[PDB]
C-alpha cells in the first residue's frame, strides 16, 4: 500500500509534463507506466525511432546526392538496420535523461500494468505478482494510444506489420503498400521512398491530408510522386491476404496490388481496456478516448485525463503542454490554459508546417486576405543545404496587415514556422506583417523567407 | 544617362536599396566594378564562407558517424561545391535585377561633382551618369597593413584564402575577430593545426563571457591552439612555410597565413573629395540617423556592424528615406558561423550586472536535448536572461547547431512592448516536437524554477 | 506588363498564363474552380499547378468576380470573397460563344441556345 | 549545334568546340546516375573490369 497526492498513469510527454507541473507545486506524486523503462511512446516506439529513421535517410540521400562524396565510390544501398540502429544511442540518452529528472524531483515510479478500484484506489500489477496498492486524492491519465488493429486483418503474418511492429523490419523490401494517408503513414511512405522502396500508399480520401492548405498537399503529393510514391485517392480495403513472399491487397474497387510488406497506419485507438474505468464508473468511447473539459477534468472531479488519450491533436509536444495544463488545473497554480491552437507539423521529407488558418478557410470566411510567397528554389541557404524545393507561404490581413495563417513546406519548416507562430499570438496591432520589414535577421539563414515572403505581400498591396 | 537614384555596388545594401526604390516608381540603377552581380557578400564574403562550412560539417557528420564508415579530401574539392551556390545567387539577383527594369553598368565609379558620376571599366570606357538621389554601397576590403608580404604564395587574406590549392599541415590566423574564429573553426574541421592570434586576452570580448568560453573551449578541444594578448612583430615568408616573430618573443612556423585583422573602407576610388566628403581612417563614412552624408543627396548605407542582412536593412531604409519606411538598424542579433554556430541579441549578463538590473538566468544545455541528440550534434547551450520581477526579456544567448534560427523566436518575442514581452509565452505557447525551438520552454521552465 | 490577371482557368488561360508567366510577368490566374482542369487527370494537374506556382503564377481557388474597374495605371478586380487584385493588364479567357447571332437563323427556323 | 544553328537564324537575335561539347557531361552524369541506380536497387552485382 502506497499512499501520495497526485498519481500519473503513463510516462509519455503528457504524463513527464503533468507530473513535473505537480512535483513543482510541492505535493508528493508518483508515476505508473507498464513498459520497462519511462519515455512512453514519444521515446520507445513511436517520435523518436521515426525521427532518428527520418534524419539517417536523409543523411544517406544527401549523402549519395553530394559529388564531394561519390570519389571514394559507388553508390551503396544500405540494409534498414544499419538506418535503425542509429536510434538506440539517441532513444537511450532520452531514457537516461528522462529517468534522470524523475530521480532528481524524488518521484516515484512504478513500472507495472494500472488497473483502476475506485475513485482513489489503483492496482499497478507487474508482469509477476506485485499487488501494489496506491491511494492518491487526484489523478492524472496518459494512457497514451496504441496502432488500431481491425479483426478482418490479420498482424500475426511476418510480411504484415503496424506502426509499431515495422520497426522489428530486417531487410529492405522491394516494394511496400501503406494504409491510410495520416501523418504515420506519409512519415513512413517519405523515409521508405528516402530508402529506395516503391511504396504504393492508399489513401481513403481524394486529397492527402485534407486538413492542410491545398498548395501545400498539392507539392507535398509532386514530390512524393517524383519520389517512387504511386499515391491512389478515394479508396477503400476490402481484403489483405499474406503470402509466402508478399502481400497482396484486394481494394473494394477491383484493383489488387502485391507487394513485399504491409504497413498499416489508419488512425489509433486509446489504451483504455486495460485501465478498467468502469470501475470508476466511466465511459470510453469506439475510439478509446476519454471526454474532458476545457480544465482537462473528466466526469469525476478527481480524475483528470490529457494528452494523445483524448484524441485531437494527438501531438508529443501538444500533449507535454496538456498533460502540464492539467497538473495546473489539478494545483490550480494559475498555470492552466486550455490547448487549442497547435501548429500542425508532418515531418516528411522535406517537412511541412502550419499555423493559423488555411486558404479555404479564409476564402470561406470572406476574410479580405493577401498572400506572400518565398520559393526555397532562390534561398542562399538552401541552396548551401543542397535542398532547393519548397515554398512559405505567409496570409496576412490586407488593411490592418494582421498575420492569419502562416504555412511552410521544405527545410526547416518546423524551425521556420515558430517564429511566425510568435508573430501571431501577439494581440492588437503587434500582430503586423511589417514586423518583417521593421526587424533585422541574420543571414544566410531560413528566417529570411519571412523578409522575402512579406516583400511578396505589400507588393500585391496598393 | 538621366536617373532618379543611382547606387554604387550591387551588394546587399545597394541591392536593396536600388529594390526599395524602384518600388516607390522612379527610375534607378546599379553600378559595380565586379564582373557580376552580388557583391562581397556573394563571389568573396559570406556565401564562399557559408558553403565551406557546411561541407566541412558534412564530412565531419560524415566521418563520426558509424553508418558511413563502411578519407581526407583535399581543399578543392571541398571549395568546389561553392561555384553552384555562387552561379544560382547571381543568375536569382540578375533576374530580379532584370524583371524590374534595372540598368546595370559594370565599371569603377567616379565622383565628378554633386549629382554626376564617371563609370569606367576595364578597356577605358567612359560613362556619365546623373541622377537626384546617389546611394553608397562601395562595401569593404580586408586590411592591409604594410610590413606584410600579401604578394607571398604562402600569405593570404580573407579573400585570398580561397586561392588555396593544397592543404596545408599548419596553419596561422591573425585576428580573432568573426571572420577569424569561422575560418579558424573551418579550418579545424578540416584537419589542420591551426594556431589563432588574438590582440585581446579573451575572444570576442562584446559577447557573453559563458559563451566565449564553451567556443575557446570546443576550439581547444578541435586542435585549434588559442594564444591571448599576443601582436606580431614581423611576418616572414619562407620558400617551405610561414614564420611569424610575435612581440612576446615567440616564433611560429606553419604552412600558411591568414589575416583577418580588421576592414578597410572601398572609398580611394570614389574620390568623394570632388563632392565634399572625407573619410576617416578606417575609410567608413559617417552618417546621421537617416543614413545621410553631409550632402542633402548624398546617402551610404551597408560597409559597423558590417553584417549583410544589416547592410541590407540599411540600405532599404537609406533609400526609404531618400523616398520618404525609414527605420535605424541599431539592434542586430549578432552572428558567428563557427561549429557549432553563435548568437546573440539584446543585453549580455556583464552589462546587466554593470546595470544591477535584477535579473535571471534561465538553461537548456543541448546534450539533453532529443533533436540535438537525433543530430548528432550534442555540445550547446541554450541562455535566456530575463527580468525577475515583470518577466521581460532581456537578453538572449545561443551557442549550437542551429542557433541563428532558434535566436529569432527570443527576438520576436523581445521586440514587443510592455506586458507582451514576457517569459510566460514560452510556457503558454506549443511549439513542435522534436525541435530545438521547444528547447526555449526548458529554459522558460529552468527560469521559473529560481523565482519565489 | 508588370503584373497581369487572368479570369477564368480554361485552355486559352492556361497556355497564356504560361507564355507570360514564361516571359516574366507575375501572373494571377484566378479560376471558378478548386482545381485546375478538373476534367483531366489529378496528377496531371496537381504537376501543372506545382508548375505554374513555381514559374511566379499565383493560382486562386474558387473565385467569382464582381467588378472590374480600370485605372489609368492598370486594372483593379474586386472579387466576390472580399480580395481586390491590382496589376497592369487583364486577361478574359472565360467561355466562348458561337458567331451566329449575325448569321439570321430565325429565316430557315433553326435556333442557338445561350452558348450561341 | 542545332540550338546554336537556331540562335544564329533567328530574328529576335562563332562558338569554340570545347564550349558545345562542354553540355555533354550533364547528361553522360545523369545517365551514368540513373543507370547505377537501377543496377542497384534490383541488386546486380558490378565488376569493372576487363573480363
Ligand atoms: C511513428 C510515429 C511518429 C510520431 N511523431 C510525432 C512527432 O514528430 N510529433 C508529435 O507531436 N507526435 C508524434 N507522434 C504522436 C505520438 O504518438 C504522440 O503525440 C505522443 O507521443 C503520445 O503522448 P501521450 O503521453 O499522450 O501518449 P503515450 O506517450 O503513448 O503514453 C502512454 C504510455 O503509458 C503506457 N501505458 C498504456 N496503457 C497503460 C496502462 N493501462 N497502465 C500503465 N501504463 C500504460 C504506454 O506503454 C506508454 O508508455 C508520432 C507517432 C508515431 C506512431
Ligand atoms: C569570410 C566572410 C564571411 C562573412 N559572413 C557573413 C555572415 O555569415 N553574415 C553576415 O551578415 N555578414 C557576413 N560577412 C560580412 C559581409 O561580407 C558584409 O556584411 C556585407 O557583404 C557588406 O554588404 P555591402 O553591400 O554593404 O558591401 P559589399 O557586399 O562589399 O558590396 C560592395 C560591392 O561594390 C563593389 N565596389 C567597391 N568599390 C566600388 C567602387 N568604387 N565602384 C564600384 N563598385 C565598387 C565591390 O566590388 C562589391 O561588389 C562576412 C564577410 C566575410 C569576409
Redesign the interface.
Known amino acids: 500500500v502506497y499512499n501520495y497526492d497526485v498519481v500519473v498513469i503513463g510516462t509519455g510527454?503528457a504524463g513527464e509534463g503533468a507530473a513535473?507541473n505537480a512535483v513543482?507545486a510541492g505535493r508528493k506524486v508518483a508515476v505508473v507506466d507498464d513498459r520497462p523503462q519511462v519515455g512512453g511512446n514519444?521515446?520507445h516506439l513511436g517520435?523518436?525511432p521515426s525521427?532518428?529513421l527520418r534524419?539517417?535517410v536523409r543523411?544517406?540521400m544527401?549523402?549519395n546526392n553530394?559529388?564531394?562524396?561519390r570519389?571514394?565510390g559507388?553508390?551503396?544501398?544500405?540494409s534498414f538496420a544499419?538506418?535503425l540502429?542509429?536510434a538506440e544511442?539517441?532513444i537511450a540518452?532520452?531514457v537516461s535523461?528522462r529517468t534522470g529528472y524523475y530521480a532528481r524531483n524524488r518521484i516515484d515510479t512504478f513500472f507495472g500494468t494500472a488497473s483502476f478500484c475506485d475513485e482513489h484506489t489503483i492496482e499497478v500489477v507487474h508482469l509477476n505478482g506485485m499487488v501494489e496498492t496506491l491511494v492518491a486524492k487526484q489523478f492524472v491519465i496518459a494512457t497514451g494510444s496504441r496502432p488500431y488493429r481491425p479483426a478482418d486483418v490479420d498482424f500475426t503474418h511476418p510480411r504484415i506489420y503496424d506502426s509499431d511492429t515495422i520497426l522489428s523490419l530486417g531487410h529492405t523490401p522491394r516494394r511496400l503498400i501503406i494504409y491510410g494517408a495520416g501523418v504515420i503513414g506519409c512519415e513512413y511512405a517519405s523515409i521508405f521512398s528516402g530508402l529506395?522502396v516503391l511504396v504504393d500508399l492508399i489513401d481513403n480520401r481524394?486529397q492527402l491530408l485534407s486538413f492542410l492548405d491545398?498548395?501545400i498537399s498539392?507539392?507535398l503529393?509532386?514530390h512524393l510522386?517524383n519520389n517512387n510514391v504511386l499515391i491512389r485517392?478515394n479508396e477503400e480495403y476490402e481484403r489483405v491476404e499474406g503470402l509466402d513472399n508478399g502481400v497482396i491487397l484486394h481494394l473494394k474497387s477491383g484493383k489488387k496490388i502485391k507487394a513485399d510488406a504491409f504497413l498499416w497506419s489508419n488512425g489509433r485507438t486509446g489504451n483504455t481496456d486495460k485501465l478498467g474505468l468502469e470501475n470508476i464508473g466511466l465511459k470510453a468511447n469506439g475510439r478509446g478516448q476519454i471526454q474532458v473539459d476545457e480544465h482537462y477534468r473528466t466526469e469525476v472531479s478527481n480524475i483528470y485525463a490529457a494528452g494523445d488519450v483524448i484524441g485531437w491533436p494527438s501531438?508529443?509536444?501538444?500533449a507535454?503542454?496538456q498533460g502540464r495544463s492539467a497538473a495546473g488545473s489539478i494545483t490550480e497554480n494559475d498555470?492552466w490554459?486550455f490547448?487549442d491552437?497547435?501548429?500542425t507539423?508532418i515531418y516528411t521529407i522535406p517537412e511541412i508546417?502550419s499555423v493559423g488558418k488555411t486558404?479555404?478557410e479564409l476564402?470561406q470566411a470572406?476574410?479580405?486576405?493577401?498572400?506572400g510567397?518565398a520559393?526555397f528554389?532562390?534561398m542562399?541557404?538552401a541552396?548551401?543545404?543542397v535542398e532547393k524545393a519548397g515554398?512559405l507561404k505567409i496570409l496576412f490581413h490586407?488593411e490592418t496587415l494582421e498575420i492569419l495563417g502562416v504555412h511552410c513546406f521544405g527545410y526547416?519548416a518546423?524551425?521556420?514556422?515558430?517564429?511566425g507562430?510568435?508573430?501571431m499570438?501577439?494581440?492588437g496591432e503587434?500582430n503586423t506583417l511589417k514586423?518583417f520589414?521593421?526587424?533585422?535577421?541574420?543571414?544566410?539563414?531560413?528566417?529570411?523567407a519571412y523578409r522575402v515572403a512579406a516583400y511578396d505581400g505589400l507588393?500585391?498591396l496598393?
Not at 520589414?437 to 529570411?448: K, L, V
Open positions: 510527454p513535473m513543482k514519444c521515446t517520435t523518436i525521427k532518428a534524419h539517417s543523411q544517406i544527401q549523402y553530394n559529388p564531394l562524396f570519389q571514394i559507388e553508390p551503396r544501398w544500405f544499419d538506418v540502429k542509429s544511442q539517441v540518452k532520452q535523461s529506395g481524394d491545398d498548395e498539392d507539392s503529393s509532386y510522386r485517392h501531438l508529443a509536444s501538444a507535454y503542454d498555470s490554459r490547448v491552437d497547435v501548429p507539423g508546417s486558404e479555404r476564402t470572406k476574410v479580405p486576405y493577401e498572400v510567397k520559393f528554389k532562390g542562399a541557404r541552396q548551401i543545404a515554398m490586407r526547416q518546423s524551425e521556420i514556422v515558430h517564429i507562430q510568435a508573430i499570438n501577439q494581440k503587434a514586423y520589414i521593421n526587424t533585422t535577421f541574420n543571414y544566410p539563414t531560413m528566417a529570411e507588393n500585391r496598393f
